Write a protein that binds this ligand. Sequence first.
Ligand SMILES: [Mg+2]
Ligand SMILES: [Mg+2]
Ligand SMILES: [Mg+2]
Ligand SMILES: [Mg+2]
Ligand SMILES: [Mg+2]
Ligand SMILES: [Mg+2]
Ligand SMILES: [Mg+2]
Ligand SMILES: [Mg+2]
Ligand SMILES: [Mg+2]
Ligand SMILES: [Mg+2]
Ligand SMILES: [Mg+2]
Ligand SMILES: [Mg+2]
Ligand SMILES: [Mg+2]
Ligand SMILES: [Mg+2]
Ligand SMILES: [Mg+2]
Ligand SMILES: [Mg+2]
Ligand SMILES: [Mg+2]
Ligand SMILES: [Mg+2]
Ligand SMILES: [Mg+2]
Ligand SMILES: [Mg+2]
Ligand SMILES: [Mg+2]
Ligand SMILES: [Mg+2]
Ligand SMILES: [Mg+2]
Ligand SMILES: [Mg+2]
Ligand SMILES: [Mg+2]
Ligand SMILES: [Mg+2]
Ligand SMILES: [Mg+2]
Ligand SMILES: [Mg+2]
Ligand SMILES: [Mg+2]
Ligand SMILES: [Mg+2]
Ligand SMILES: [Mg+2]
Ligand SMILES: [Mg+2]
Ligand SMILES: [Mg+2]
Ligand SMILES: [Mg+2]
Ligand SMILES: [Mg+2]
Ligand SMILES: [Mg+2]
Ligand SMILES: [Mg+2]
Ligand SMILES: [Mg+2]
Lengths: 172, 48, 170, 119, 116, 46, 203
Amino acid sequence: PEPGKCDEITTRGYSISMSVDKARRVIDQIRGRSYAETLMILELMPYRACYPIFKLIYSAAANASHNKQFNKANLIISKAEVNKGITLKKVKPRARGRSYMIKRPTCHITIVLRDITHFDSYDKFLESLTPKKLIALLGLMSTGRRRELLCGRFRENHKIKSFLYKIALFKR
Amino acid sequence: AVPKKRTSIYKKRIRKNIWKKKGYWAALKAFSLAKSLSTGNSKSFFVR
Amino acid sequence: LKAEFEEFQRPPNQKPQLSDVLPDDFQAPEPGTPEYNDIINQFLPKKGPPPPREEIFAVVVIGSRQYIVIPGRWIYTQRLKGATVNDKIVLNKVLLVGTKASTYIGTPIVTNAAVHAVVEEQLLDDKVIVFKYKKKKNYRRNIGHRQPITRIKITGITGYEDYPASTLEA
Amino acid sequence: TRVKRGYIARRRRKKIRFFASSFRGAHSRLTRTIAQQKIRALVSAHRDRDRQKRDFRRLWITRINAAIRERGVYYNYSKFIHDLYKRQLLLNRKILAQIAILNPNCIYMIYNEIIKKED
Amino acid sequence: MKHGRKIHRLSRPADQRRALLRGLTTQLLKHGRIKTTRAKASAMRKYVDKMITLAKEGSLHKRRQALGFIYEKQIVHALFAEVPERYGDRNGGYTRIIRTLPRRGDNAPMAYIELV
Amino acid sequence: SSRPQKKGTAHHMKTRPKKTARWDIKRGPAVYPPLPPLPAEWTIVS
Amino acid sequence: RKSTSASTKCTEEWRQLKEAVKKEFAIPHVPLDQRWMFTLEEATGPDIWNTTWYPKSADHVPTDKKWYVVDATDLILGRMASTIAIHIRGKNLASYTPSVDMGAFVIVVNADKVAVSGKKRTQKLYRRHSGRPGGLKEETFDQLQKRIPERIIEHAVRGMLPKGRLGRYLFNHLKVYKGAEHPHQAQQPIDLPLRDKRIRVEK
RNA sequence: AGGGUGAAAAGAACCCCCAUCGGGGAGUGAAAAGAACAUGAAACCGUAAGCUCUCAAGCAGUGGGAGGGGGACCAGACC
RNA sequence: CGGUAGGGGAGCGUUCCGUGUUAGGGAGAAACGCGUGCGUGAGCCGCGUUGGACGAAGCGGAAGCGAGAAUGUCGGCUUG
Ligand SMILES: [Mg+2]
Ligand SMILES: [Mg+2]
Ligand SMILES: [Mg+2]
Ligand SMILES: [Mg+2]
Ligand SMILES: [Mg+2]
Ligand SMILES: [Mg+2]
Ligand SMILES: [Mg+2]
Ligand SMILES: [Mg+2]
Ligand SMILES: [Mg+2]
Ligand SMILES: [Mg+2]
Ligand SMILES: [Mg+2]
Ligand SMILES: [Mg+2]
Ligand SMILES: [Mg+2]
Ligand SMILES: [Mg+2]
Ligand SMILES: [Mg+2]
Ligand SMILES: [Mg+2]
Ligand SMILES: [Mg+2]
Ligand SMILES: [Mg+2]
Ligand SMILES: [Mg+2]
Ligand SMILES: [Mg+2]
Ligand SMILES: [Mg+2]
Ligand SMILES: [Mg+2]
Ligand SMILES: [Mg+2]
Ligand SMILES: [Mg+2]
Ligand SMILES: [Mg+2]
Ligand SMILES: [Mg+2]
Ligand SMILES: [Mg+2]
Ligand SMILES: [Mg+2]
Ligand SMILES: [Mg+2]
Ligand SMILES: [Mg+2]
Ligand SMILES: [Mg+2]
Ligand SMILES: [Mg+2]
Ligand SMILES: [Mg+2]
Ligand SMILES: [Mg+2]
Ligand SMILES: [Mg+2]
Ligand SMILES: [Mg+2]
Ligand SMILES: [Mg+2]
Ligand SMILES: [Mg+2]
């Protein structure tokens, strides 16, 4: 079926007491980074948000180890996002009988860790082939093995997708 | 003085991105510092 | 069955190996061999040669507009009243007949020239929104218009030969 | 019998919004704005279906002018056209402009006919 | 502006900043090493060295000048014992400053000032 | 100053363009000889 | 650093595949020189005869265009500048399009010998304004022509070019030199046709 | 002012991250519907993929459409 | 066969009632999302890797029956 089933662990923190903007400031830096680098960075960052985000990422790495069997060395943070949570309002008095509204923003954070090495067989093997060679090699195998070969990250990384549907190499 | 209008979506996204870029320079300092404490050779620095 | 096998193997065993989906049986056909070129012809076809048409074109008047018609091609016009699908019409207003050896220029019309066409369809055009609006007078009117249209195919341009040609002859 | 307005509103709105796809900014978001923007769109559209007919004639005439001015030192659009008419040819301006770009030799021929007869 | 104004303000008025510095140096001489903010450290150097250089001479005059800086007598006497022993050959420069991880509460840069 | 200006429609009356010259007024569309009768637009061939 | 890793290799190869197949089935370009009504290939294509011809990318490409030289000595400023504007704009080609640059390059040489009628040499006034108040500056035509004479013809032609993006981009096609010599000999300039009667002044 | 997890609490044993909260597996269940739980529009906040903006003046559209991309079966069309 | 104030003619839709404990519907209803479909338009007809139990058409009836403006109003969410 899809790459998302093979490579991915998803972890949601719910209701962290960071406001979405603050937390975003940290999450933008760790997007696309090796799990190692992201660790040490998040240990030494000045921001407050860094600590909850840290607990989160450590967790998601543990999940990829103990659940789906991945190597921690090969984890990168592939997709990370922060969405707004439930806002708690409180009213405080101002000068001269006026009030004002304080919001105590929460957030959900979603980190999606993605193994690099998984698929590497098909990956490098398909890199090995020139563009003609590959089409000659795919002239043998049934619809089954075609779909099984090319179901790696390959078609996306090199941007072949709409080309191969045009070469009649596939069915949708 | 007040805001005669409301700030348009895209411009606001640009200003807040500017404020998010400081996170980029902070992440660089943090990385360099980590690689300095990761050799245990610094006599100017201390951790416990 | 190789789909079920490789999917049950990518299901059961996580981290798939290349040797299982593609066995060591297939070397691929050599890049210079006929068995290579049949496949590479199938999947990457060479552009086929263009269909033959006459080298000729006419300029004909239909519904008081003037079209350039080349044979084998279909054009859109005003509905022709009392035309049915699969009708052989002849267009008799022909201003200009070009050929790459000749050009016939009517005064006004090329005499005896006829353009044989066949009415392939009767349509309604892409709906145009006619919209009448006046600010502050609180008046807007939304009205669609679909024009009836006739889609016809030019087959041949004939009966010019006798008429005097001119040429650029240097 | 109480009647909530229900979906009758949001269908209308949604069908309007479909129109306004690819409008920059809040012309693609807020319904209230989107309304106006829809009207103005439809309006300009109507206007320029009329401008169009003016404009291509503009164009064609211009191209014809250029195409002829190449031949004689003294020759114009005006002179040409006048001669097309006193020779009784019906070719309109779209056609002479298209034959000007796409078959330039043809227009040279036409000019040679007009001259021969005006001679 | 300030051109050539060399003093460390520590964001306190004169009175408080004096008292602060007296305090911090009695702490340094009592414990031998301490943890503070980089600013406070860099400022504290001068007065540490003043006390040390003071005790190298030992006269009743000098000792009275130290007593009127440091807060606790005991520390002063200890100084006028220890220093000729420990620092006799060191001509100036008696403090190490080893900086650390910043503070959690405010992100104030920290540091470790040692009596060397 | 004892003279006024021309505001609004007054000004338009004054300034709008006019051909005064008797020769340009009396002009007109060119007279072209009639066309020979033209054939039938489109005929049905059965 | 250009990575020669199998990945980027692969990608470039593939992209030349896409480009190859897109080139083979696409309709060929036939330039406009004795270009007859249609090629047997276009005949399968869209309808280009019953719509107005609009230029495609292969046409206007900068490297093609004509170059012209105007010797401006004893020419009359305005009358020449109109000609120049026409050619730069492209209004003299059958292929003219308002939205595109079909024009030529024009090289003006001897820009200090350009001639002007009547008292203009001393009367005509080139003004430019700082943007501060009291910031107005004025030159007579002659002060200008002794100081930086190219600016006179640039300033007269830029007036007659369209204004706005295409206008400015057009204005770069006007190359002006004060001496009788231009360093464009490589571009093989043709001379400029002038159909005006009054453009040549005689003393 | 604050209504609607499921038919039934069967309200999630056990392992992992783990100071708790929170989560990921396993297990329950027709479905996770997972307790802030039933359909879940808009504003608003983002994330990814396609095309594109840093000489530019503009109620932001519209008629013309360069170049680039996408899903087709009337492949000359549509987006 | 331009059109404001304004008058007349012809229609569409919403919820409910009659036909009706209707036709149809866990072989997926309402709703929600989509359309190279059809209307002068209000809208209709078709479609769904959403949704989980109702409910058309026709021929009629009734109204808490159609919203962008009320410094309207109540919730939600922005801007600063
Ligand atoms: Mg009070
Ligand atoms: Mg207040
Ligand atoms: Mg009114
Ligand atoms: Mg009700
Ligand atoms: Mg109501
Ligand atoms: Mg658009
Ligand atoms: Mg302060
Ligand atoms: Mg005091
Ligand atoms: Mg005090
Ligand atoms: Mg000193
Ligand atoms: Mg006056
Ligand atoms: Mg005026
Ligand atoms: Mg007149
Ligand atoms: Mg659990
Ligand atoms: Mg505890
Ligand atoms: Mg728990
Ligand atoms: Mg489970
Ligand atoms: Mg089960
Ligand atoms: Mg819900
Ligand atoms: Mg500029
Ligand atoms: Mg630019
Ligand atoms: Mg601009
Ligand atoms: Mg009327
Ligand atoms: Mg009225
Ligand atoms: Mg209905
Ligand atoms: Mg209904
Ligand atoms: Mg109902
Ligand atoms: Mg029933
Ligand atoms: Mg349905
Ligand atoms: Mg209902
Ligand atoms: Mg319906
Ligand atoms: Mg109905
Ligand atoms: Mg049920
Ligand atoms: Mg009924
Ligand atoms: Mg009511
Ligand atoms: Mg409202
Ligand atoms: Mg409100
Ligand atoms: Mg805000």
